Design a binder for this molecule. Structure first.
Ligand SMILES: Nc1nc2c(ncn2[C@@H]2O[C@H](COP(=O)(O)OP(=O)(O)O)[C@@H](O)[C@H]2O)c(=O)[nH]1
Lengths: 311, 314
């Protein structure tokens, strides 16, 4: 596939060129990844002009429909919205070709939206680092809103926070999640407005004893109904407010640089993993070592030196 | 130095054997470190019969004073208490006055290594030595300015946060990342007078907020208590809670369960430490590694481009 032509169509907003480049970046084949490595670098100065928001929520109510509604609001307002899934179980599959795009009915047909399932990789750090490469591609292609969502039942919340500028947690009327939140939004806001309002008050009180990482921002709690689009404009205004404030201080850029280095190393460690499971003997010996350490038969360091010797 | 004897003696609770064994494992070379790995491996079945407690708090909160008092209470009750430090600053290289002369105790500063993972992994190896030598209490402390808390938590069974007595507008607050780790919060400087009053006030604010983030189930809900490390206050009550936790999480099998996940994590951290030693083995490679990482950080090259450059240096 001609890479310069691919780059120009991607830079001109061609959705199929973008998908093609992402597919190359998602690929589990080394020659594919390598090809689109130059393209991403080349296009790097056109990346970053976007709000990156990570979104997670309690098993139950309303994340997909809330994202569909938030998504639909931002497109109708002139934005281009990518929605990327991170799911740790894609370390145990080979990915998804089609994904699951109609869990968000309006965005699934919204020509100004782009939806992509969790990429496959050997490690969760690898899944996430590929997501970062995908985010960069979407941004080069002119997407100014990147929503990254946790999709497993597994533990992807920290990785998604470390992929984004702002972490939104959606709750009903897991301690780790609370202190990742730059905002909490209580879902299903009149008979239940009462309940949401109260719960919001409770969560606001809980948050108080957690010192925010920066003096520039103090996480608020808000109420919404994703079902009926209520509260979303205000919710979004805060995220925008946060963008202006932490951009002025340089803190968004500072967070992004930290994340980028974390992802680089996750990819180095992914490549190490891939070597260790890349043939039968090494793979068997690696599992043997790990198993001995877990079972308390050999010490962490004995396990480690056995693994080091296979490399 | 012969290793057959050393092992026999370490197993007998010979503190000179222990001290020697440790020196070998903190030594920054092979041959030494190899032999003291096989020993650790040999004594593994004598490890683990101990309560492991991670302790953190901001510098000046009174941690070293509190550990001094707590350790001395535990040694007077017939425990053998090792006190180990994890310091991020030892990647670039007697304050407990009573414990320092107490032969029922054993204090070691942070070990040196390339990465934090490696510092923490070394400390696990040191904990196993202490345990095989008869130590039934291991206290691991964060030391210095740094992000050492997750590591200390992942070395121990119970994570204890010491906090300042400030209440209201002077309420300290729990640092990002510590709340998910904390198994108990102890507000220190609860002295006779204003201390006990303000500290209790602080504790009640933490306690009422924690009650929101909480069910009645779960094997363990974190208590909030007050202590005075300096004046000996509330330390017995604190300890009984760590003992209740030990009992509760043993019956459910969750202590053993957590230890298994920790040990694997430390194995991978040593793997990664050995990788880091290779990337810093020569000036040529150290310089190129640093350039690749700066390229990524500067937004000049993408994370994966940075990673490909480092892969090649391997
Ligand atoms: N009033 C009071 N002061 C204390 C207490 N514990 C420690 N201090 C004092 O606080 C200062 C710092 O103590 P230190 O143990 O070095 O704290 P670290 O930096 O957290 O290890 C010293 O001057 C201590 O005497 C306490 O319970 N009450």
């Amino acid at each position: 596939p001609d890479m310069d032509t691919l780059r120009e169509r991607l830079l001109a907003g061609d959705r199929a060129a973008l998908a093609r480049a992402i597919t190359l970046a998602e690929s589990r084949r080394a020659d594919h990844r390598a090809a689109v490595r130059d393209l991403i670098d080349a296009v790097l100065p056109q990346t970053g002009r976007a709000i990156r928001v990570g979104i997670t929520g309690v098993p139950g109510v309303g994340k997909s429909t809330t994202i569909d509604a938030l998504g639909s609001l931002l497109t109708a307002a002139g934005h281009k919205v990518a929605v990327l899934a991170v799911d740790p179980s894609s370390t145990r599959t080979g990915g998804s070709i089609l994904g699951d795009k109609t869990r968000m009915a309006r965005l699934a047909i919204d020509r100004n939206a782009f939806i992509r399932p969790s990429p496959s990789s050997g490690t969760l750090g690898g899944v996430a680092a590929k997501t970062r490469e995908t985010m960069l591609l979407c941004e080069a292609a002119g997407f100014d809103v990147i929503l990254v969502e946790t999709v497993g039942v597994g533990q992807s919340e920290t990785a998604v926070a470390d992929l984004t500028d702002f972490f939104l947690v959606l709750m009903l009327p897991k301690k780790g999640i609370f202190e990742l939140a730059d905002m909490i939004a209580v879902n299903k806001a009149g008979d239940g407005e009462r309940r949401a309002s109260a719960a919001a008050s409770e969560y606001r009180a809980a948050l108080h004893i957690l010192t925010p990482p920066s003096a520039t921002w103090t996480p608020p709690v808000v109420t919404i109904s994703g079902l009926h689009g209520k509260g979303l404009d205000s919710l979004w205004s805060r995220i925008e407010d946060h963008r202006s404030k932490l951009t002025a201080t340089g803190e968004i850029a500072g967070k992004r640089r930290e994340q980028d280095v974390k992802w680089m190393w996750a990819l180095v460690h992914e490549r190490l993993h891939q070597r260790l499971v890349g043939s039968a003997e090494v793979r068997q010996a690696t599992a043997e070592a790990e198993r001995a350490v877990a079972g308390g038969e050999h010490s962490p360091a004995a396990g480690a030196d056995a693994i080091a010797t296979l490399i």
